[model samples]
Target: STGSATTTPIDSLDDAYITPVQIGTPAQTLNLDFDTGSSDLWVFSSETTASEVDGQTIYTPSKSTTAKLLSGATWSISYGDGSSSSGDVYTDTVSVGGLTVTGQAVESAKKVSSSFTEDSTIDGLLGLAFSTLNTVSPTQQKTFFDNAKASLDSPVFTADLGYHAPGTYNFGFIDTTAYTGSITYTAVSTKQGFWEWTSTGYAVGSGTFKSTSIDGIADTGTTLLYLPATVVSAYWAQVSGAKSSSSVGGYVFPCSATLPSFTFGVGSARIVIPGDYIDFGPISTGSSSCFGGIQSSAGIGINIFGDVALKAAFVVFNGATTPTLGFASK
Candidate 1:
C-alpha cells in the first residue's frame, strides 16, 4: 500500500522535523523524528524517570493491550551530537501515515541525555536506516520500514525536508507532484549501514563545479552539513568575518556577512543550498553571532549531508536491489 504523511519543523531552529506515529492497541499517537541516521523506534515512556519526563508526552504501555515486553531485550544509542537514549524493548503494533506493522519493536526510554530530556516537544525517534543499525541487544530488531516493505506497493520512500517550513515523507510510491524536474538516480552503497553515496563535485556560489567526488551519507538526524576540514576551511575563508572559534565551537561568522551559495553535484544534477541556509541560527537562541551550518567532519571521519543540505533538494530513498538514491530540484 502507498502512504504519505506531512511533517512539521520544530520552530525556526530547523533543528528537527517530526511526524505523527501511532503505537499500541488503542492507538496512542506520538510525534517522532523520522531519522535516517539511526535504526530504532524509541520513545519517552512510562519507564522514563519522572524528573527526566519534563513536558514531553510519554507512551503508557499498560494502557495498550498489544504491548508486550520482549523478555530481556534492551537498546541504547548515542548520537554524534552527544544526545543519547536507552531502554527496554516491547513488541507492539506500530503505524505511520496509513501503513501498519504488527509486533514491531518499540523501545521505551529509561534514560535520556540532558539535550534530549530538554527537548520537550520531541516524543521519540523513528529511525529509517538499515535494520543492521538497530540498537536492540540479545537479538537485533527490524525497523518499521523493513518490516512493512514487503506489504507496500513499492519498497521506496521519499524525504522532503524544509527549513522553517512543512514537508512530507511518502512511502511505497513516489509522488511526482512533490518535486520538480526529473529525479536523477545514483547507486547507494549501504556497506556503512547508511544511505551512503558519492557526490560528483562541489562549488561555492556560481563557481565551476570542482570534480571532487566526496563520499557522504544522507543523515536526516544531523542538523548541519559536515565536510572535510580542507573543504570547510576553503569555504569559510571566502567569507569576511568567518573564523573557527574554539569557545563557540566549529566556525562562526557575523550575522550580517554576505554569504555565497554552496552547490554539490549528483551526477549531472546540481543541488544548491542558499547561503542564508548556511547561517545556522545563532551561537545561542538570541545572539548576533551565528554558527556556520557547514562544519568540518575531522574527528567524525565520515562526512554527513545533514538536514541543512537535504532540505535543499527532494530525495528519493530507493530500496531497489542496489538501493539507489534519486535527487530532484525542489
Candidate 2:
C-alpha cells in the first residue's frame, strides 16, 4: 500500500531509520538505521565518544535535556566483518509521521568506525528480524521488540525492504506492489533462526539425477549457496558435464560449456536457479580448488542456500511475530 509520499514511522527503541526527525518541544532531528540480519537496535552520535564516534550517529543526550539510561544495561556487538562497538541503553520519546511511539529501547553506541560515523546518509540498521535470537532485553535483557511491543502496529512487525529503491530496509508494511507471490513462511528450526527448505529432488543444467531426500537451510546473511559434495557431483554430471577439477575447495566448472539450468525441488515449489548464477568467479584447475558458487560449508550440517541463491526469489522478513519472522513474496 503506497501511502502517498509518507515518512516511515519511528519506534521507541528499534534500529528504525538513519535519518532525522524532531524530538521534544525544542524539535530536532535524530539519526537512525534499520537492520534485518540481526534483531538489536542501536545508534551512534557526538554524545558518545569514549568508545570512539569517529563516524556514527551522535545523540546529544545532554542537549535533549531528556535522554536517560536505564541503569546497568549496556549494548554492544561485534560486526560480522570483525569490528565491534559498545554503547549505553536508554529510552526516549520517538515519533514518525503523525504516529508517536514513546519509551522505546535505544542503544547509544559511543564508539563507531570511520565508515559508520562518516556516512551521514544512513546512521543505523533497524533490525526487522525476530527476538528468538536477540541479545538485549528489558529485564534489562530484552530486545527492542520486548521494550517497544506495546507500540508495534501488528501482532508481528514486518520489514518492507527496498522502501523507495535500493538501500531501504523499512518497518511496518510490505510493498506487495513490486512482487508477485505470497509471502512464504517456512517452518522454523528451534536449533537456529534460519529459514530452511526440503529438497524433493535435485537436477542440474538438464543433466544427472539424484533421488529426492534432503532438506536444506537458507540464509540471506550468507553470500553463496553451498551444496553437498555428492549432490554437486551428480547434478553436474547430468548437465553440461562438470568434472571435478580441483579438490582444494570451491567447485569451479567451465562456464564455456553449454550448461543447463538447475532447479531444486521444494515441495510444489520448483526453484529454478539460472545457470549463470552458478558461475563462480576466478577459477583454476589447480589443487587449490575452484572458487565456484557450489562449494562446501557442510560441517554445520545440511545445505545452506545463501544470498546469491536467494536472488532467485524475493525475500520478505516478517518481524510482527516475536519468536518467528514472517516471509512473503518480494
Candidate 3:
C-alpha cells in the first residue's frame, strides 16, 4: 500500500462535496477512502504546513485542471499510521466514473513528507465505508454518499478495486446476491480506521486446513491480505511444483503454474481466493515477490484483508444504518 507505482487503470475523480442528504447543505467534495476495512474521511489541507498523507499520494488542486478552491477556510488529516498531511479547504465541481457533483469540499496539501507519497499517482483516497465513519459538521462533511444522496440513484455504494488496474477503486451500487448464502455479520467495536477482528484460526485448501491458526483482523483499507508465514507457505505448498523463493521477503511464485484455489472464513462467510487471483507482478523476478498475501508483520501491525481476498468478495459496511458489516462473493 506504500509503493510509488499507482500505474494501474486509475480512476479519475471530479469535484464533489462529501456529506449527508438531510444535512440540507451543499455537498463538499471530500477525498473518499475507497477503502473496505477502515472507514474515515480526511484530506491533506492546502492550509496544513505538513508534508504528507502517509501510505498514500498527495494531490494539489491548483495543479488539477478540474479543481476549485474555497476562500480562507482550512482542513488537514493525520492517519493512524503515524503519518499526516495538511492543506487549505476549497469548493469545486468533482467528476468520477462518468458522474459529476458540484460544490465538493476538498483539502489541498500544503505540506507532505516524502514517505507519504509512496503510492503511484495515488494523490488522493476516497472512503466507501459505512456512514457511521463519516466526519463533518452535522457529521456530513466527510461522506460523499449522504450529501450526494439526492444525486445518487440508490442508498448503497459498492467499490470494485480492479485488480488488472492498480488504482481501479471503482464505486457503484452494491450487489447483494454475489454470495452463495448469507452469514451473520460481526459488528465493529469502534469507528477508527483500524478494523480489528478476532479470528478463530486460519484455513487453507479447505475448512480442513485450519491448523496453523492465524487469528487477526480484516481491513478493506489494505490492498493485500496478510497471513502468517507458515500459513502462506502452506497455501503455496498446495500448488503443484511450487517452490519457495523470497522477493522483498514475501514469498512469490508462478501463479500461472497450476496453482490451487482456496477460501478463507471471516465469520460464517468464506471468501474464496484463486491462485490466478494473485499478482506475482508483470516482471519475472517480482512474480514471487508480488504475493497474493502477506507473511510478515514484524513491526507492521495485525492482519489486513488486502485486495487479494476483497476482489473475490462483496463486503458491505452499513453506513447509514449502524455499526455492522456484511459480505458476499464477487
Candidate 4:
C-alpha cells in the first residue's frame, strides 16, 4: 500500500508544516503537524479544557463509533520550547491520504500548554520518529508510519518540505520526479529514537566546505536550523549588521542585510539553502530587525536540521530492519 499527502506551511515564515489526517469513523479531518523529532499522535479533542480551546478544531471521540478507550492508558509529551500536552488514549481507524490503519492510537489531549492553544492553525501533532520515543504509559504505542509500514510497498516515507509553499509527504515509495540527481543514502542511528546522523560538514555561502562531523537529527517539528555555536557565529559574522542579541533572544540583523546562503553536506552531496530563507522574518510587526533562520544549538545539546534545512532537499525516512536516511537535491 502507498499514500501521498500535501503538507503546507502554517505561517508566512514557514514556522511549521501541516498535513490533513482522517481519524475515527465517518472520518474527522484535522490539520496536524507531522513531527519527526518526537513520537506521539496527539490531538486537540473534546476532552481539552475549554479555556485552551481557542479557535482550533477538536476531535470528538464520542461522535465516532470506532473510537475505543485504551483503558488506563495516558500520555504526556514535552517540547524543547517548553510547551506540553497530556491526556488519555484511544484507538481508532486513522487514515492519511489513501492509506488506512485500523486501531491506531489517537491520544486525546485533556490539557495543553499556552503555546499550542495560542496557535489556532495546528490542531495536533503526528509524530514520525521511532516508536521508542512514544510517551504513552503501561504500553508504548506505535507511530502512524510504523503501523502502516508492514503493509506498504516499501517500508519508507519521504519528506519534501517547501519554502512558503505546499510540499508532499509520500509513504511506501519515493517520488522519483520530486528530486534531481542521485540520492545519497546515509546510516541512521535511532538509539535516541530520532533520525540522527552526522553530516560531512557545512560551508557558509560560497566559502570553503569545512570538513567537520556535525551530528544532528532531521526534525521537521522544529522551525529553524540549529548548528554548533562556532558554525552559527561564522555564518552571522558575514552579515554586516548581524548580532547575537540578548534582548531578542537570538541572532538578529538588519532587515536590509545581505544574507548568505548556507550549504550542508550529505556525503558528497551538497544542499544549498537560499539566502532569502535564512532571513526568517522581522522580529516583530513592522520591525526593521529580522531573526536568522539559523541559530546556535549549543544550549540545545544537539544540532538540529529542521525545516529550514529539510526544505533544501528531498529526505527519505527508510523504516527497514536497518533504518537509513536518503538525501537528494531538488
Candidate 5:
C-alpha cells in the first residue's frame, strides 16, 4: 500500500508546512504539521481547554465510534522553541491521504503553549521520527508511520517541501519524475531519534567546496537552516551590510543587499539553495533589515537542515532495517 498528500506552507514566510489528516470513524480532518524531527502524533482536540484554542480544528474522539481511550496513558512534548503541549492518549483509526492505519495512537491535547494557541493554521503535529522518541508515558506508542510501514509497499517516505508553494509527501514509493537527477544515498543514525546524517561539506555561493564532515538532522519542523558558525559567517561575509545583531537575535542585513546562494554536498551531489531563499524577510514590519534563513547552530548544539534547506531538494527517509537518507535535485 502507498499514500500521497499535499503539504502547503502556512504563511508567506514558509514558517511551517501542513497536510490534511483524517482521524476516527467519521473522518474529522485536521491540518497537521508533519515533523521529521520529533515523534508523537498529537492534536488539538475536544479535550483541550477552550481558552487554549484559537481557530484550529479539533478532534472529538467521543464522536468517533472507532476511538478507544488508552487508559493510564498520557504524553507531553516540549519543543526547542520552548513551546509545549500535554495530553491524554487514544487509539483510533487514522488516515493520511490514502494510507489508513487502525489503532493509531493519537494524543489529544489538554493544554498547549501560547505559541501553538496563536498559530491557527496548524491543528497539531504528526511526527515521522523514530518511535523511540515518542513522549507517551507508562507505555510508549509507535508513530502512525511505524504502525503502517509493515503493510506498505516499502518502508519509506519522501518530503518535497516548497518555497511559498505547495509540495507533496509520498509514502511507500519515490516518484522518479519528482526529481531532476540521480539520488545520492547516505547512512542515517537513528540513535539520535532523528534523520541524522553526515554532509560532505558546503560552499558559499560560487566559492570552492569545503571538504569537511558536518553532522546534522533533516528537520522539517524547524523553519531555518542552521550550520556551524564558521560556515554561517563565511556566507554572510559575501553580502554587504550584514551583521550579527543581538537585538534582532541573528544575522541581519539590508534588504537591498544582494544575497548569495548556498550549496551543500550529499556525497558527490550538490544541492544549491538560491539566494532569494536565504532572504528570510524583514526583521521588523517595515524595517529595511532582513533576517537570514541560515544561522549559526552553536546554540542548538547540532546542525539542522530545516525547511530552508529541504525546500531546495528532494529528501527521502528510508526506514529499512539499516535506515538511510536519499537526496536529489528537484
Candidate 6:
C-alpha cells in the first residue's frame, strides 16, 4: 500500500503541524497531528462532554455504522508538560491519503485536559511510533502506521516537515525529489517509546563541533528543539543579548538578534539548522523579545528534535528492519 498526506503548519509552527485523516466506513475526516513521539489514535468525540470540547469538532461514532466499540478497552495519555487526555476505544476502518487499513483502533475522547481543550485546531493525533507505545489498556492497540505497514510496499515513511510552511508525509514510498545527496542512516532505540538516538555532537554557528554525546528523540509533535542545559547555554552564549528567563521558563533574546546556525552531527555528517530558523517569531507577538527555538530539557530528561530541527532535513522512519532513521539534507 502507498499513501501520502499534506501537513500544514500552524502559525510559524509554534504548535505541531496537522494533516487530514479519515476514519470509519463513511469516513469522518479529522485534522490530526502525526506525532512520532506518542502512540494512540484519539479524537474529540461525542463522548466528550459539551463543556469540554471548546471549538473542536466531535466525532460522532454512533452515527458511523462501521464503528464498533471495544469492550472494556480505554486509552489515556499524559504529556510531559502536564497535558492529558482520556477516552474510550473503537475499531474501524481508517485511511490516510488514499491507503486504507481495516480494524484500526480509534480512541474517542471522554475527557481532556485544559491544554487539549484550549487547542481548537487539532481534532486528534495519529501516532507514528512503535506499537509497543500504544496506550490502549487491557488490550494494547497498534497505530495506523503500524497496522498498515504490513501491506505497504516497504515499511517506511518520510517526513518532509516544513518551516512555517506546508509539508508532506509519505508512506510506503519515498520521494527522491524531496531530498539531496545521500541519506545517512542511524539505528534507533524504541525502548523508551520514541525514535530515540544518540548524537555524536553539536556545534554553535560555525564554531568547532563539541563532542557532547546527547541522547534525544526525533519528536514531530513538539514545536521547539530541546537539548541539555549546558548545550542550550553554550548555543545561546554566542548571541549578544541571550539569557535564560525564568519568566518564560526558557531562553530568550532580542528580536533583532542575528543568531548563527546550529549544527548537529550524525556520525560523520552534519545537519545545519539555519540561523533564521532559530528565530521562533516574537515570544508573544508584538513583543521585542523573542523565544529561542532551542531550549533546555532539564526537567524533561530527554532532548527533542522538534519541528525546528526536523524541518531542516528529510527524515525517513524505517520500520522494515531494526527501525532505523535516515536523515538527508533538503
Q: Write the per-residue lDDT of candidate 2 for residues 1-330, one digit (tens) a residue.
A: 111112232322111234344343344455544434455566665546744544444566556655667677766766543555566766665544333445655666667665565545555554434555555543444344444455545433343323213323333445567456665554445355434445567677655545675666555434456777777776566544456654534455555554456666544455566766565544543432224556565564667765445555554444434334334334
The whole-model C-alpha lDDT of candidate 6 against the native structure comes to 0.89
Please write out the lDDT profile of model 5 over residues 1-330, one tens digit for every residue.
999999999999999999999999999999999999999999999999999999999999999999999999999999978999999999999999899999999999999999999999999999999999999999999998899999989999999999899999999999999999799999899888999999999999999999889999999999999999999999999999899998888999999988999999998889999999888889989999999999999988899999999999999999999999999999
Q: Lowest lDDT 10-mer window, candidate 5?
A: 275-284
Write candidate 1's Cα lDDT for 1-330 as tens digits. 877888899778788998999999899999999999899999999999888888888899999999999999999999888889999999999988999899999999999989888898899999998989999998999999898889888899999997789899989998888888999998789898999999997898777778888899999888899999888988898899899998988999988887888998899889999998898767887888889989999999899999989999899998876798889988
Worst 10 residues of 3 by lDDT: 15-24
Return the TM-score for candidate 2, rounded to 2 decimals: 0.60
Q: lDDT for model 2, on a 0 to 1 scale?
A: 0.51
For every model shown, the clashing-pair count is: 0, 40, 62, 0, 0, 0
Clashes of 6: 0
Where does candidate 1 have its weakest 10-residue lDDT segment? 201-210
TM-score of each: 0.98, 0.60, 0.62, 0.99, 0.99, 0.97
Computed on alpha carbons, the lDDT of every model, listed in order, comes to 0.90, 0.51, 0.48, 0.95, 0.95, 0.89
Q: Give one digit per residue, the lDDT tens place, for model 6 in 1-330.
A: 899999998565446788999988687898998998999999999999778888887788888888999999999898777888998999988889998999999999999998888889889888988889899999999998888899999999889988778899999998999999988988799899899988889999989999867889998988889999999999999999999999988899999889999999887788999988888767786999988999999998889998888999999999876898889999
Q: What's the CA RMSD of model 1 in angstroms?
A: 1.1
- Residue pairs in candidate 5 whose N, alpha carbon or C atoms collide under 3 angstroms: none
Candidate 6's C-alpha runs over 4 A off are none
Assess candidate 1 and give its TM-score to the true structure. 0.98
Ranking by lDDT: 4, 5, 1, 6, 2, 3
| Residue lDDT tens for model 3, 1-330 | 000112233322111112211110233333334554433333444443444444333344555555564566554445435655555555555545434556665545566555446433344555554445544333235445444545554444443444454333223344444445664465654434434454445556554746333445455455556766566677767666455555435555555555566677667556677655664453344343234453444346566566566666655544444445555665
* Candidate 5 lDDT score relative to the true structure: 0.95
